[PDB]
Amino acid sequence: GYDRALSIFSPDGHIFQVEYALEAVKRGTCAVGVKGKNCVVLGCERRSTLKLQDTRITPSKVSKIDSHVVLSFSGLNADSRILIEKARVEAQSHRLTLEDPVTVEYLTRYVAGVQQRYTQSGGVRPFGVSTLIAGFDPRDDEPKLYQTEPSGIYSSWSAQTIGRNSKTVREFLEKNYDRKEPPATVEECVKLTVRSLLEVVQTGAKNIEITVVKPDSDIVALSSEEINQYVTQIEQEKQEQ
Amino acid sequence: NKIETLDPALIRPGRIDRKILFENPDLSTKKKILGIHTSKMNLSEDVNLETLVTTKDDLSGADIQAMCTEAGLLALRERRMQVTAEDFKQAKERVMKNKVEENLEGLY
Amino acid sequence: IHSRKMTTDDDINWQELARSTDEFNGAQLKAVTVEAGMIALRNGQSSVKHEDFVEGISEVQARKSKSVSFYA
Amino acid sequence: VEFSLPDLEGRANIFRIHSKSMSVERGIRWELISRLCPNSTGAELRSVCTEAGMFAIRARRKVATEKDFLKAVDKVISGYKK
Amino acid sequence: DRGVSTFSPEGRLFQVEYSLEAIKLGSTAIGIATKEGVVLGVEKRATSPLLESDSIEKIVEIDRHIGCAMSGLTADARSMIEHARTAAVTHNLYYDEDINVESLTQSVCDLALRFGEGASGEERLMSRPFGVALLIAGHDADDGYQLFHAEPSGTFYRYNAKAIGSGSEGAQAELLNEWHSSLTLKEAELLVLKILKQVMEEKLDENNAQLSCITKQDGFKIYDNEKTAELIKELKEKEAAE
Amino acid sequence: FRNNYDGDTVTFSPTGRLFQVEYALEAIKQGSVTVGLRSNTHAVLVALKRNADELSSYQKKIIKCDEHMGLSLAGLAPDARVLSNYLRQQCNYSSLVFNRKLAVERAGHLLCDKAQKNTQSYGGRPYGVGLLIIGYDKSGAHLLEFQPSGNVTELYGTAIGARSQGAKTYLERTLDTFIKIDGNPDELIKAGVEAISQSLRDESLTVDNLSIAIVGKDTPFTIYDGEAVAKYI
Amino acid sequence: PPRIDPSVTMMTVEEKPDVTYSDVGGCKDQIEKLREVVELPLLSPERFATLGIDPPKGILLYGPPGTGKTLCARAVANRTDATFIRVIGSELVQ
Amino acid sequence: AGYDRHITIFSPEGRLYQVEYAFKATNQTNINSLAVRGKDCTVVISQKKVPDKLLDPTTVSYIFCISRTIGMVVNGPIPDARNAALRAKAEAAEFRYKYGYDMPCDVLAKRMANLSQIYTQRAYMRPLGVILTFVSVDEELGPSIYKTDPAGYYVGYKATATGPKQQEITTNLENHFKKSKIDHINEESWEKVVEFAITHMIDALGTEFSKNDLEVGVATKDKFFTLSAENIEERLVAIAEQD
Amino acid sequence: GTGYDLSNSVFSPDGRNFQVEYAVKAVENGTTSIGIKCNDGVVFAVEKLITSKLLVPQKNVKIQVVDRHIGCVYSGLIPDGRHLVNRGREEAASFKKLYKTPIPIPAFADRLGQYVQAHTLYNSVRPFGVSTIFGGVDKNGAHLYMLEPSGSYWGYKGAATGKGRQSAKAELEKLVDHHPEGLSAREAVKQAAKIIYLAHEDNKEKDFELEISWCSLSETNGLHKFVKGDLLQEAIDFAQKEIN
């Protein structure tokens, strides 16, 4: 029985553990994402310093909770992995009793609800990772992308990016994307994802992972050569002037 | 460099409202610092200022001056008055690795 | 003693003003005479009424100060 | 006499006095301007009026409109870093 | 450093005084309780233009005749809503009756004391109380429409017009001369929307502004972006002249 | 010294007193004021209700834990319900197993047991609130003044909160008056009005600012509100 | 003494300042405290001789500088038409 | 910072400061007691201080009774003494519950050794400010003395001592045993052993005491008791004759 | 390195707990209490601080009781002294549960002693800052013990603690030489009232109330009773004449 409290109230009215937990997200691996009318795309990166990574033994940064539901995170890897297992166990329980596949709205409030407990319970450290929950709903083609935060507050975002140099890359997603006219083509959502990752990490042929989510329980994982094709088309057309 | 040690009465708020931070130099500013040192420094026709600034740690004015300084020592040890393009690339990696590399890799 | 320097009608009752306060030293009781003496000047009165001393005591000082909130 | 930081009601009349000298749009509200800035020393409020007639020039406005005070107050808040 | 059980020399707690600061740094929930109903409204305060107003909801529904809002930090609000609906929905099981709004407020305030270092008035512990301010409304068959305020300290009062969050000093200052005894549903919806536009930083729209109404026969209702925009244009036409 | 000796309520002081125990008394003085009186039969609790705005209501300061027994709180409002809920459980336990009304003397013994445990073990804190408890049994009326430090004393009548010494002035000189009044609930209420009137430095008590509760042998515990107290104003 | 330096004009002497409400508006508590000990004796001092007491020998003003602490003395001196003499501590140190 | 003298942790010098301060609390009462062994029996004598005239000499005892055989001698405050007294009487009873015969002498010293370690090893328990001394007659080795310190250590002793003056009492006991080349004292009757311990006690101290200023424990074979006020007075009169 | 008084388990360099020494100071700030140990019984006496005339006599009594055969009195904080008696009363029924016999004085002495010594070991709990004085009559006789906040108690022919214990201990020692054999229960009440008035010199700022209770064999037959009737009236007038 470890009873020692952690979360307190700062003189300004905030929590010290919550403030420093969000700093680990901005200092972690940056991950972008977008969603169109019929599709949603979640991009990632890989450290270019020392790369021995083999494609088979490298764990994917975007976890798959359900056939039509995907889960990505930018932040602490190990603290997120515990919630990834609990999300898949809850997906089994939600499909068991209720006989319904887990949705994005239910998974968001669950992860935000679990993270909320560790913040309000003395003796456990709150998580320092902010997960990005995406995917579709049963018999629904509308993409649901909800931003889960370590504090427990969640919202919906069409284009959201958290990680290093986040304030700079978010300015590109506002000009290159509109709320009233989202791209209806699954290929256009991939091009908008690459354009956001070219301003952070140079090169990045095999260092970028892009996951495409399709309706009717279909997920197409782009290989290393398939992602490089979209990189060449954008870089050659960016240099026209 | 630090305004915390200055006299707050000497600041006289409302007379001076302008506090300008420091911004990192772009590709254009870095070529200006190189043009001063590489002017007298011997360089072949394969030495271009755009290649050196392409891959860089975004060094300040002190490390950029030290980059061309280390490149001159490679020619002195080999007893040659003409510095090739390999010395600028070799000296660029040494100064880049003396500032930030892995940032003590971590954060799970 | 502080009421001797103040010019009044000599209606001050020492029993009523003593129980109206809580633990005031010799320096704090002197400030009550100064505050209550200037209250009558706001209404244009030269002398100081005995109820003006209560107004200085009923004024909020040294205990709750200007903070009234939370429990009540 | 003890001095304290002025609240939303305390700063409501402060910005209205300083705006009387300058010529701005009278259809604005100074109670919202004082709400954007938290509790701060009154000496720092004078620097806000000096920044009101500046950003308005960038917008090609000889007078300070309602949107001019939005970017002017948000500029001095991040400068204090408190 | 400093424990949660340390009392201030004025008879208060340090952690409780700092918990109220997070309320004034959040959003503003404005509501007014009238005889014909209760009108509630909030501002979502979207920083980035890419934020959608569909996911964020500051006004939930505990019961058909009972509803509440939230302001300040919205993280700790989702926990109390689960416990508030627990003593509410199950009240139809135990007593088979609509739970009193005042009785529901007492259950919310009793769950804000769960903090502390774990002396036992209760079994399981809690790190810190909820830093959210809950404005609780509702209607019953006895006293009529009731509007309370759930504070993290546990004190609660019945307010006819209550604006929590950052609009505590700004909105309540105008409620003195703009509120009186006899009120209608049309005057209540326009007075809340007019104050909501004045307390908001940017221009008010149908997204960040979401209103609500409390009715006896129909119950708790939510106006969408289309119905909210109807009151926006109607307010500008009536306020254009004088 | 000062904050150096406080890690908790457990740590002592060179003066033989606990600072954290004394801090609970400050919450009673700056809160609401409550006045009560009794002689041989009935009891009249005069309590005041404050608020944070003129458009708000007045929170009830009188908790009813029994038909023949009641109390009044001056202090923290939500923290007083914790002690009353335990009192309500003891009344139901005494009316079920023992099938006997809980006496006022034995009620105060169970109330002080909660605050003493929080001032003993580490991590606990006492919840400062004033308690004036009344009631009637086969002996007579009993008014026990309860303190958050565990102190309890039976008195004819007393007052706590702001201007507590002002209301005790009337009860001291009239102590030989109201004790001879038995079976007259009207004069017992009028005596409490004159005691609280001298302690008011703010304004007069309206219909919603005056809460009067009375309990007795033939008359049960009733909470007067609205125009019920207008006859004594 | 060889102490005479004709620098004594370094201070700022403003007779009957025209500034009434600048930083003073919005703060009620600071106004009422300076009305009894300044405005009244500078207007009708004869009532204080009958009152029996004397004004305080000093007024302690503590708080953040430049917030209107100095302008508060100029506001109360407007109705009484009093000469405002300010001694700056920065120029006072020599 | 100062956590070395607050809670028990490994110090840069390798010493536990919190436990060492408990030894200095043993000398607060200033009680010097020695334990000697006869042939078939063992006799222990402890000092008794009565500062207040209102004290009851029958209630005040520095030597308790664990059972009909094994005794206990404690030097220090009574609250820390009863902590080890309740466990010693319980563990002696728990032995015959799971076994059924009498606990030996060295067993009780080991049972109380691990318990005194719990105070030293665990930070939330403070070490006792008393020293345990157990004397009895073993069914095999005969007379034996086991003195359990608050440190949790126990070893066989010929004749031990405690208190601030233990250095002077030990010196007297060393010169006596080296001449006889035996650990204990050889005597038939147990009454003469009481006079033997008093002789070495007076020469080490240098002062005399009354019947109420001393407490003489006597552990015989398969029997244990404590001399009353009239029995201790008889020992002081009997030793007055001859030597 | 200071901070030895911030915990109960931390020992001072001299080997004396500071929290134990601070508990004695709390006794000197409370109402004093005395006691008399007779042959066939024991006598307890304690005064009360009178704030005003609102206090109703013979209602709130600081003298506790254990079953019918044992009385108890404490000097110190109110909640600390009353909670310790509740632990002894609940455990007294457990003794009659298993052993069927009424609990004697020596069995009740170690009953309260194990709790006080337990709070000094655990730093997370606060020890009792009150001095408990209990006594009664058992099969072997009548005994009077005085418990201390440090958990130290022994036999006492008289018990004096609190603020006025300095002048109270002098009178208890004189009664031993004046009556080496024993003392009657009726005379002990009159003698205990004079000791209370002797310590009243520091209490002269307010009024006083005397509460005396005793339990004996040949009179109460092992029953805790309070002094009332003409026995209390004659005891007050006897001590007031000797004190002045």
Task: Check CB contact under 8 Å for I155 and H123.
Answer: no
Nearest CA in chain B to A49: B102
Task: Check CB contact under 8 Å for A49 and B108.
Answer: no
| Separation in Å, CA of F226 to nearest CA in chain I | 32
Task: Give the residue among I64, A92, D72, C7 at the shortest CA–CA distance from G52.
Answer: C7
Contact C/F (≥3 CB pairs under 8 Å): yes
- Report residue D64 as tokens: 């300070």
Contact (Cβ atoms closer than 8 angstroms) between residue H25 and residue H37:
no
Task: Give the residue among F214, F218, F212, F232 at the shortest CA–CA distance from F49.
Answer: F212
Nearest CA in chain G to C40: G51
Chains in contact with B, counting 3 or more C-beta pairs less than 8 Å apart as contact: A, D
- Report residue E181 as tokens: 């005894």
Q: Considering CB atoms only, which of D1, D14, D41 is closest to G30?
A: D1
State the count of interchain CB pairs (< 8 A) between A and B. 13
Nearest CA in chain B to A77: B108
Task: Check CB contact under 8 Å for D50 and B13.
Answer: no
State which amino acid sits at residue A141: D
Task: Check CB contact under 8 Å for I52 and F11.
Answer: no
Q: Cα angle at A56 between A54 and A58, to 5 degrees?
A: 60
Query: CA H27 → CA H24, H166, I15, distances in Å?
Result: 6, 11, 9
Query: CA H221 → CA H42, H71, H96, H144, distances in Å?
Result: 9, 12, 19, 12
Task: Give the residue among I137, I23, I11, I139 at the shortest CA–CA distance from I81.
Answer: I23
Q: Considering CB atoms only, which of F7, F109, F119 is closest to I126?
A: F119
Strands A210-214 and A40-43: antiparallel
Q: Considering CB atoms only, which of G29, G51, G53 is closest to C46?
A: G51
Q: Considering CB atoms only, which of F12, F15, F175 is closest to I23?
A: F12
Task: Give the residue among I170, F41, A173 at the shortest CA–CA distance from H52.
Answer: I170
Confirm or reject contact between E48 and chain A (CB < 8 A): yes
Confirm or reject contact between I15 and chain H (CB < 8 A): yes
Confirm or reject contact between I126 and chain F (CB < 8 A): yes
Q: Report resolution in angstroms.
A: 4.2
Contact (Cβ atoms closer than 8 angstroms) between residue H218 and residue H191:
no
- Go through D25-61 and write b for each residue having 16 or more CB atoms within 10 A of its CB, e for each that does not: eeebebbbbbbebeebbbbbbbbbbebbbebbeeeee
Task: Check CB contact under 8 Å for A49 and B107.
Answer: no
Rounded CA-CA distance D55/D64 in Å is 8
Q: Does residue C58 sit in helix, strand or coil?
A: helix
| Separation in Å, CA of E169 to nearest CA in chain C | 14
The HSE-up count of residue D74 (CA atoms within 13 Å, CB side) is: 8
Rounded CA-CA distance A41/A32 in Å is 9
Query: Which structural domains are found in chain H, ordered by start?
Result: 2-242 (3.60.20.10)
Q: Does residue E148 sit in helix, strand or coil?
A: strand
State which amino acid sits at residue G44: S
Q: How many other C-beta atoms can be found within 10 angstroms of the C-beta atom of residue E115?
A: 23
Task: Check CB contact under 8 Å for G51 and C41.
Answer: yes
State the count of interchain CB pairs (< 8 A) between E and F. 84
Select the residue from B12, B16, B17, B20 to test the D interface by mutation, using most D Cβ atoms within 10 A.
B17
Rounded CA-CA distance A119/A109 in Å is 15
Select the residue from D29, D30, D32, D77 to test the E interface by mutation, using most E Cβ atoms within 10 A.
D32
Query: Which structural domains are found in chain E, ordered by start?
Result: 1-242 (3.60.20.10)
Q: Does residue I129 sit in helix, strand or coil?
A: coil
Task: Check CB contact under 8 Å for E170 and D70.
Answer: no
- Report residue B23 as tokens: 């911004």
Task: Check CB contact under 8 Å for C5 and G52.
Answer: yes
Nearest CA in chain B to D50: B14
H/E run at residue H101: none
Nearest CA in chain E to C64: E10
Select the residue from E127, E166, E168, E210 to test the A interface by mutation, using most A Cβ atoms within 10 A.
E127
Confirm or reject contact between G58 and chain C (CB < 8 A): no
Task: Check CB contact under 8 Å for H54 and I13.
Answer: no
Chain D residues in contact with B13 (beta carbon < 8 A): 43-44, 46-47
Contact (Cβ atoms closer than 8 angstroms) between residue I86 and residue F112:
no
Confirm or reject contact between A52 and chain B (CB < 8 A): no
| Separation in Å, CA of E58 to nearest CA in chain D | 22
Task: Check CB contact under 8 Å for D35 and E173.
Answer: no
H/E run at residue A43: strand A40-43
> CB neighbours of B5 closer than 8 A, spacing ≥ 6?
none
Contact (Cβ atoms closer than 8 angstroms) between residue F42 and residue F219:
yes
Full 3-state SS string of chain G: CCCCCCCHHHCEEEECCCCCCCCCCCCCHHHHHHHHHHHCCCCCCHHHHHHCCCCCCCCCCECCCCCCHHHHHHHHHHHHCCEEEECCHHHHCC
Task: Check CB contact under 8 Å for D2 and G62.
Answer: yes
Confirm or reject contact between E17 and chain F (CB < 8 A): no
Place of tokens 């109807």: E230
Angle of helix A224-238 relative to helix A186-197, nearest 10 degrees? 70
State which amino acid sits at residue H224: F
> CB neighbours of E96 closer than 8 A, spacing ≥ 6?
none
Query: Which structural domains are found in chain F, ordered by start?
Result: 3-233 (3.60.20.10)
Q: Terminus-to-terminus CA distance in chain B, angstroms?
A: 35
Rounded CA-CA distance A215/D78 in Å is 45
Contact (Cβ atoms closer than 8 angstroms) between residue I122 and residue H123:
no
Feature table: binding site of G = 63-70
Confirm or reject contact between C32 and chain G (CB < 8 A): no
In CATH, the architecture of A1-240 is 4-Layer Sandwich (3.60)
State the count of interchain CB pairs (< 8 A) between C and E. 9
H/E run at residue D24: none
| Residues after which chain G is discontinuous, using a C–N cutoff of 2.5 Å | none
Chain H residues in contact with I2 (beta carbon < 8 A): 2
Feature table: binding site of G for ATP = 63-70
Give the residues across from F35 on adjacent strands.
F46, F159
Instruction: Please tell me the class of the I2-244 domain.
Output: alpha beta
Nearest CA in chain A to E20: A13
Rounded CA-CA distance A73/H81 in Å is 61
Task: Check CB contact under 8 Å for C71 and E10.
Answer: no
Q: Does residue H182 sit in helix, strand or coil?
A: coil
Q: Considering CB atoms only, which of D13, D16, D43 is closest to G65?
A: D43
| Separation in Å, CA of C11 to nearest CA in chain G | 16
H/E run at residue I75: strand I70-75
| Separation in Å, CA of C25 to nearest CA in chain G | 19
- Report residue I179 as tokens: 């009556």
DSSP string, F146-185: E-TTS-EEEES--EESTTHHHHHHHHHHSHHHHTT--S-H
Contact (Cβ atoms closer than 8 angstroms) between residue I114 and residue I70:
no
Select the residue from A9, A137, A146 to test the E interface by mutation, using most E Cβ atoms within 10 A.
A9
Q: How many other C-beta atoms can be found within 10 angstroms of the C-beta atom of residue F33?
A: 24
Q: How many other C-beta atoms can be found within 10 angstroms of the C-beta atom of residue F132?
A: 26
Confirm or reject contact between E82 and chain F (CB < 8 A): no
Nearest CA in chain A to B102: A49
Chain B residues in contact with D79 (beta carbon < 8 A): 19
| Separation in Å, CA of D17 to nearest CA in chain B | 17
> CB neighbours of H31 closer than 8 A, spacing ≥ 6?
H46, H47, H49, H62, H75, H162, H163
Contact (Cβ atoms closer than 8 angstroms) between residue F44 and residue F157:
no
Rounded CA-CA distance A75/A129 in Å is 4
Task: Check CB contact under 8 Å for A28 and B101.
Answer: no
Task: Check CB contact under 8 Å for B13 and D51.
Answer: no
Burial label, H161 (beta-carbon count in 10 A; 0-12, 13-18, 19+): buried
User: Catalytic amino acids of I?
Assistant: 31
Residue H223 — φ and ψ, nearest 5°? -155, 145
| Separation in Å, CA of I218 to nearest CA in chain F | 32
